[PDB]
Design an enzyme around this catalytic site. Structure first.
Site, short mmCIF file in Angstrom:
data_model
loop_
_atom_site.label_atom_id
_atom_site.label_comp_id
_atom_site.label_asym_id
_atom_site.label_seq_id
_atom_site.Cartn_x
_atom_site.Cartn_y
_atom_site.Cartn_z
N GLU A 83 -56.28 0.56 20.34
CA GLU A 83 -54.90 0.92 19.95
C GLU A 83 -54.23 2.03 20.77
O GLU A 83 -53.00 2.10 20.83
CB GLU A 83 -54.81 1.28 18.45
CG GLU A 83 -55.60 2.50 18.00
CD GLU A 83 -55.23 2.97 16.59
OE1 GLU A 83 -54.28 3.77 16.46
OE2 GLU A 83 -55.88 2.55 15.60
N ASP A 139 -50.60 -4.98 15.41
CA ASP A 139 -51.26 -3.68 15.26
C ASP A 139 -51.52 -3.53 13.75
O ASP A 139 -50.60 -3.27 12.99
CB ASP A 139 -50.35 -2.56 15.78
CG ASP A 139 -50.93 -1.16 15.60
OD1 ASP A 139 -51.89 -0.97 14.83
OD2 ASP A 139 -50.41 -0.22 16.24
N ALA A 140 -52.78 -3.70 13.34
CA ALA A 140 -53.14 -3.67 11.93
C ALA A 140 -53.70 -2.30 11.62
O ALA A 140 -54.88 -2.03 11.79
CB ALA A 140 -54.13 -4.78 11.59
N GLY A 141 -52.82 -1.42 11.17
CA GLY A 141 -53.15 -0.03 10.93
C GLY A 141 -53.70 0.24 9.55
O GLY A 141 -54.01 -0.69 8.79
N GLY A 142 -53.83 1.53 9.27
CA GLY A 142 -54.39 2.01 8.02
C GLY A 142 -53.53 1.73 6.82
O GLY A 142 -54.04 1.52 5.72
N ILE A 173 -48.27 12.70 3.75
CA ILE A 173 -46.96 12.67 3.11
C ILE A 173 -47.05 11.85 1.83
O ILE A 173 -46.67 12.34 0.78
CB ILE A 173 -45.85 12.16 4.08
CG1 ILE A 173 -45.66 13.19 5.20
CG2 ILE A 173 -44.53 12.00 3.33
CD1 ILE A 173 -44.70 12.80 6.30
N1 ADP Z 1 -42.80 0.53 3.60
C1 ADP Z 1 -43.69 1.55 3.74
N2 ADP Z 1 -44.77 1.66 2.94
C2 ADP Z 1 -45.67 2.65 3.06
N3 ADP Z 1 -45.55 3.60 3.99
C3 ADP Z 1 -44.52 3.64 4.86
C4 ADP Z 1 -43.51 2.59 4.79
N4 ADP Z 1 -42.61 2.84 5.74
C5 ADP Z 1 -43.02 3.95 6.39
N5 ADP Z 1 -44.15 4.45 5.85
C6 ADP Z 1 -44.83 5.66 6.39
O1 ADP Z 1 -45.52 5.25 7.59
C7 ADP Z 1 -46.89 5.65 7.52
C8 ADP Z 1 -47.87 4.74 8.23
O2 ADP Z 1 -47.25 4.26 9.42
P1 ADP Z 1 -47.97 3.64 10.72
O3 ADP Z 1 -47.35 4.42 11.86
O4 ADP Z 1 -47.74 2.17 10.64
O5 ADP Z 1 -49.55 3.95 10.58
P2 ADP Z 1 -50.72 2.83 10.64
O6 ADP Z 1 -50.76 2.37 12.08
O7 ADP Z 1 -51.95 3.57 10.19
O8 ADP Z 1 -50.31 1.75 9.68
C9 ADP Z 1 -47.20 5.76 6.04
O9 ADP Z 1 -48.34 6.60 5.85
C10 ADP Z 1 -45.88 6.31 5.49
O10 ADP Z 1 -45.77 7.73 5.62
C1 N7E Z 2 -64.27 16.51 9.72
O1 N7E Z 2 -63.20 15.99 10.50
C2 N7E Z 2 -62.38 17.01 11.17
C3 N7E Z 2 -61.16 16.26 11.64
C4 N7E Z 2 -60.37 17.16 12.54
C5 N7E Z 2 -59.01 16.49 12.82
C6 N7E Z 2 -59.24 15.44 13.88
N1 N7E Z 2 -58.87 14.14 13.37
C7 N7E Z 2 -58.39 13.22 14.23
O2 N7E Z 2 -58.14 13.46 15.41
C8 N7E Z 2 -58.13 11.82 13.67
C9 N7E Z 2 -56.67 11.80 13.26
N2 N7E Z 2 -56.19 10.43 13.11
C10 N7E Z 2 -55.87 9.62 14.12
O3 N7E Z 2 -56.05 9.88 15.31
C11 N7E Z 2 -55.35 8.25 13.66
O4 N7E Z 2 -55.08 8.30 12.27
C12 N7E Z 2 -56.36 7.12 13.95
C13 N7E Z 2 -57.73 7.46 13.34
C14 N7E Z 2 -56.47 6.89 15.47
C15 N7E Z 2 -55.87 5.80 13.26
O5 N7E Z 2 -54.53 5.43 13.66
P1 N7E Z 2 -53.38 5.08 12.54
O6 N7E Z 2 -54.16 4.12 11.72
O7 N7E Z 2 -52.41 4.48 13.47
O8 N7E Z 2 -53.13 6.47 11.99
MG MG Z 3 -51.02 2.88 13.94
#
Ligand code: ADP
Ligand code: N7E
Ligand code: MG
Ligand code: ADP
Ligand code: N7E
Ligand code: MG
EC number: 2.7.1.33
Lengths: 265, 259
Positions: A70, A6-9, A124
């Site tokens: 995802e 799972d390659a997240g943000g 955060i």
């Molecule tokens: N080692 C770390 N480095 C950076 N952020 C971390 C770490 N451990 C936990 N976090 C927290 O976890 C969040 C992202 O987690 P994650 O659930 O994996 O999201 P994503 O799927 O977008 O990567 C970060 O934004 C931060 O608040």
């Molecule tokens: C102008 O935009 C108004 C936005 C109103 C708020 C609504 N925003 C959302 O629902 C997107 C919030 N984010 C998420 O659902 C997640 O971050 C994802 C975009 C699915 C990505 O997942 P991760 O990378 O795991 O956080």
């Molecule tokens: Mg994620």
């Protein structure tokens, strides 16, 4: 071996399965290059991908790979992790608290996205940095545990003074609502970081409890890496979930729900 | 007279005359009230008691939720709307969300993201204590370097939700470290996150109670076009119909008088 990613943000989560010995690996998304180089030197019977950066990996790899959405993957890995850990829940809300936040209703069969908000781990870190100059995640979340929110947050009883309020007086009324009432006071990095996590914890729970009532479940599963090394967040989330008559659940390796699910779809 | 003595602003309606006064100057409101007798007085809000005990005449005290709903229904009729049902979202110091079914209101939730947060967090990011300077400072701020969209997380992939959505408020900050986060940009992001949380809450209970109408009220909308645009665009984006109303921040005060 079999590997799910799972390659997240912010984080890349990898799970390797050997036979029945799982391996859980976290890497930064900014070091995605180093995940590719590593992947290319493994013997991989099956590869599965999900998350926002899945395509960056797929394109830079010399091996075919399935790519899943995802939301579907998280649901599938979460169900497996809940069974393994002895929760047999007929339905539930799950709230994936990652860089951002996505809210799902799981009816027993499938998931459905029911909402989301941009208050989560990225806030955060981001707002945290703006309020403390601290970039190191460990430093930031550790410092916030020691914080007090009293001079920053405004409870309902502060607005209602002596008189009796129409909702519980201890509830937060206004996040950062007390700052203007306590000028002069320093506002310490600890206190401010506690208030950030405080507001992020409260918005997520509010959304989750609301949606829980909408789809008629009392079960709310919280996942995502945002909860790692952040006791305050879990406390915030947990106390208020209970306060509203719902049952909160955290899950061992719940932040790997996506990477596990990718492997089982 | 009808008064809604809130956490931040005291709203006075004399029967119509509309006057606002700071809650921290509540002393001057009593002083003003006593010096000129009044045929009937009605009170509501958190600081209704502070007034009632420092005054002469038996002013009735109502629950602010019931008053807000009674005044809003009146404001809506006067301003040509005939809505069968709606959510209303009272964006004050904090925020209270209500479903009005055609007959009565019901509180369906609330959240502490609102005007108190815009002021407080706003100060903590800019040192600015004057409400008018702060909200003006925000108006032409740019959120690009602060906020993280869905399309940023999903660079090489097709996203499962619209890419223009905000994904993470402040979640781009760490990606723009060697950069100046100016007070305007940062204040735009505060209002941004407040507006988005209120909208999300609003549209969610709107779906739950099967109404497409969402009336927004409270003084958080005074001198803050950005907050209105943010709330409005995204409400529309989620298939609901947003409404602002003239003197909608005086809904409580008006409602106190009618009950
Ligand atoms: N080692 C770390 N480095 C950076 N952020 C971390 C770490 N451990 C936990 N976090 C927290 O976890 C969040 C992202 O987690 P994650 O659930 O994996 O999201 P994503 O799927 O977008 O990567 C970060 O934004 C931060 O608040
Ligand atoms: C102008 O935009 C108004 C936005 C109103 C708020 C609504 N925003 C959302 O629902 C997107 C919030 N984010 C998420 O659902 C997640 O971050 C994802 C975009 C699915 C990505 O997942 P991760 O990378 O795991 O956080
Ligand atoms: Mg994620
Ligand atoms: N002149 C002003 N001074 C301070 N805050 C203002 C002013 N005008 C609008 N506001 C904003 O509106 C909020 C008050 O909304 P309101 O509905 O009056 O709340 P309450 O009922 O708690 O007093 C403030 O927290 C602030 O965000
Ligand atoms: C400890 O609790 C953690 C979080 C609880 C968050 C839920 N909070 C709420 O529902 C209350 C939010 N605030 C509001 O509804 C309003 O600000 C009121 C308290 C009704 C006061 O109205 P005003 O003074 O008009 O803002
Ligand atoms: Mg009010």
């Amino acid at each position: 071996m079999k590997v799910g990613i799972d390659a997240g943000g912010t984080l890349i989560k990898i799970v390797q399965e050997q036979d029945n010995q799982r391996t859980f690996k976290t890497e930064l998304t900014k070091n995605i290059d180093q995940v590719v180089e590593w992947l290319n030197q493994q013997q991989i019977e099956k590869l599965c991908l999900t998350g926002g950066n899945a395509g960056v990996i797929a394109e830079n790899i010399n091996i075919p790979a399935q790519i899943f959405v995802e939301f579907d993957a998280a649901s599938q890995g979460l169900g497996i992790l809940l069974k393994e850990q002895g929760h047999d829940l007929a339905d539930y809300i799950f709230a994936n608290v990652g860089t951002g936040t996505s809210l799902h209703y799981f009816d027993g069969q499938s998931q459905r996205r029911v909402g989301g908000i941009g208050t989560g781990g990225g806030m955060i870190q981001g707002l945290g940095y703006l309020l403390s100059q601290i970039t190191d995640y460990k430093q930031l979340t550790d410092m916030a545990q020691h914080g007090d929110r009293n001079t920053i947050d405004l409870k309902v009883r502060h607005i209602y003074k002596d008189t009796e309020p129409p909702i519980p007086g201890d509830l937060t009324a206004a996040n950062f609502g007390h700052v203007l009432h306590h000028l002069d006071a320093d506002f310490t990095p600890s206190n401010k970081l506690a208030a950030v996590i405080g507001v992020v914890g409260e918005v997520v729970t509010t959304m989750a409890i609301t949606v829980a009532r909408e789809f008629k479940t009392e079960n709310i599963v919280y996942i995502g890496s945002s909860f790692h090394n952040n006791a305050l967040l879990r406390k915030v989330v947990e106390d208020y979930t209970v306060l509203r008559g719902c049952k909160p659940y955290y899950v061992e390796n719940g932040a790997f729900s996506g990477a596990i699910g990718a492997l089982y779809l």
